[PDB]
Amino acid sequence: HWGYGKHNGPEHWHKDFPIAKGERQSPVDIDTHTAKYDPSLKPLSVSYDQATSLRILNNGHSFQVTFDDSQDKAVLKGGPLDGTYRLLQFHFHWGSLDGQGSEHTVDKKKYAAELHLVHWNTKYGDVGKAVQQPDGLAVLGIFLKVGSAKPGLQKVVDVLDSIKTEGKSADFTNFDPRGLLPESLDYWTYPGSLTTPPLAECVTWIVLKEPISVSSEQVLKFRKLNFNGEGEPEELMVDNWRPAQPLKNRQIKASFK
Ligand SMILES: [Zn+2]
């Protein structure tokens, strides 16, 4: 039932998911001048060399690339995290125009898109259990700005025509998520939530300071996706982003000076 439209979008979500008005909702505006540098934060450990991608799916709200998370093959550790978090999937949020599309904002600036790499804490054994825990998930967020192409994104771009409408999926093996990462792993971190229903308050957010650049042609391909199933009226999958939510007694910490 939920979506991103006038009648089912973010301002409606609290009726089905009352935690939408909770104390640790995401995304937020990152006020860079208010974030405190924390010299106790470790460098983030991103160990993606043995990642095994499986499939790409249009889920009606975004598209997602799924990984084999049955072993410790692609894991996030360190930074603000205690323990080991397995990569489950990545997906994106994007706009109808290049000046909107990100969920997090940086001093109110919106990027054209935002990549989310979703990981779950192995101490909970499975993602469904993990979303019921306050430290269940770690989502690595990466901003996309429009300029030069990101060569590592092209394999994703090129298969989107095969998953246009909701419910379509394809095999998507040997995709290397290292090709989506910026140079620097400098980050902001704070405790928050899933940014889509069920909006569970289970996420340690790790948002990288450095955006990746993608080309206009790459982002245009995202915007050709459809929210609708084949057979329903065509509605472009654009503006699939939740706006910034109240910070409410949280501190955002910076890994860098
Ligand atoms: Zn997301």
Work out the number of other CB atoms within 10 angstroms of the CB of residue 168. 18
Tokens found for residue 128:
């469904």
Q: Does 34 show up as a binding residue in the annotation?
A: no
Is residue 116 part of an annotated ligand binding site?
A: yes
Say how many Å lie between the CA of residue 112 and the centre of ligand 1.
Answer: 14
What is the distance between the alpha carbons of residues 148 and 135, in angstroms, rounded to a whole number?
36
Residue 89 and residue 67 in contact, taking contact as beta carbons nearer than 8 Å: yes
How many domains, the chain? 1
**Angle value at C-alpha 43, between 39 and 45, nearest 5 degrees:** 160
Token look-up 């993602």 returns 127
Could you tell me if residue 239 is left (phi over 0), alpha (psi between -120 and 50 degrees) or otherwise beta? left
Q: How far is the centre of ligand 1, averaged over its atoms, from the C-alpha of 93 (Å)?
A: 6
Tokens 């300071």, located at residue: 209
Alpha-carbon distance 107 to 21, whole Å? 22
Q: Kindly provide the b/e burial profile for residues 67-84, where b requires at least 16 CB atoms within 10 angstroms of the residue's own CB.
A: bbbeeebbbbbbbbbeeb
Determine whether the annotation assigns residue 93 to a binding site. yes
| Residue 61 Cα to ligand 1 middle (Å) | 10
Range of the domain at 41: 1-257
* SS3 assignment, position 163: helix
Q: Is 12 annotated as a binding residue?
A: no
Resolution of the experimental model, in Å, one decimal: 1.1
Contact assessment for residue 128 and residue 103, using Cβ atoms and an 8 Å cutoff: no
Per this entry, what is the length of the chain?
A: 257
Technique behind the model: X-ray
CB count within 10 Å of CB 209 equals 19
State in Å: Cα 118 to ligand 1 middle. 8
Locate the DSSP E strands across the chain.
29-30, 36-37, 44-47, 53-58, 63-67, 75-78, 85-94, 105-106, 113-121, 137-146, 169-171, 187-192, 203-208, 212-214, 253-254
Separation of CA 116 and ligand 1 centre (Å): 5
Residues annotated as catalytic are: 61
